Amino acid sequence: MEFDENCSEIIKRNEWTNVQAKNINYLIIPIPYVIIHHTVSLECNSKDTCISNIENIRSYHMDTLNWHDIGYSFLIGGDGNIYEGCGWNHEGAHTYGYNKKSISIAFIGNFQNKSASNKMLNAAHKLILCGKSKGILREDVRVIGGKQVIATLSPGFELYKQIQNWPEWVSTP
Numbered sequence: 001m002e003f004d005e006n007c008s009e010i011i012k013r014n015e016w017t018n019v020q021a022k023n024i025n026y027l028i029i030p031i032p033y034v035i036i037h038h039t040v041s042l043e044c045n046s047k048d049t050c051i052s053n054i055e056n057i058r059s060y061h062m063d064t065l066n067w068h069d070i071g072y073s074f075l076i077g078g079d080g081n082i083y084e085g086c087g088w089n090h091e092g093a094h095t096y097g098y099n100k101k102s103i104s105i106a107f108i109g110n111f112q113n114k115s116a117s118n119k120m121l122n123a124a125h126k127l128i129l130c131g132k133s134k135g136i137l138r139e140d141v142r143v144i145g146g147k148q149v150i151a152t153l154s155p156g157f158e159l160y161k162q163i164q165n166w167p168e169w170v171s172t173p
Contacts, residue, residue: 035146043108111158
């Protein structure tokens with residue numbers, strides 16, 4: 001139900017930055033895949049620190065790397081909040097070969113050698129249900145870690161084992 005399936009809680013892009021995307025291309029909806037990543041960036045434990053961290057990721061992607069936008073669709077802070085990156089509708093830059101057919105959910109931190117907190121996992125899982133509930137994600141949406149489709153250890157081994165508990169996780173893309 002809506003307590004589990006409504007994400008009005010998502011911190012929108014304009015709440016963390018004043019810089020719009022330089023270019024937008026729209027994802028085909030419904031979307032067939034969700035890719036779970038970690039950011040390998042400094043962790044954040046409060047809304048204020050998560051806002052700063054995500055602004056720095058955006059600045060790095062857009063200004064340093066000259067990308068069209070922050071590369072991740074959504075980000076999960078250690079505060080347990082969901083932050084809109086490029087969002088449900090805009091093609092990201094996170095997973096080679098998958099950017100046009102997925103959103104990414106990026107857990108802020110490095111989860112190779114430590115688990116994500118309960119509040120982080122629960123936020124990401126609620127986001128997936130919200131997408132399904134809205135018809136944004138396919139009813140049979142396939143959740144995978146980045147490491148299942150590209151040459152990466154993302155979302156980190158510890159977090160990977162955690163997402164494997166999710167019923168929407170698939171062993172093969």
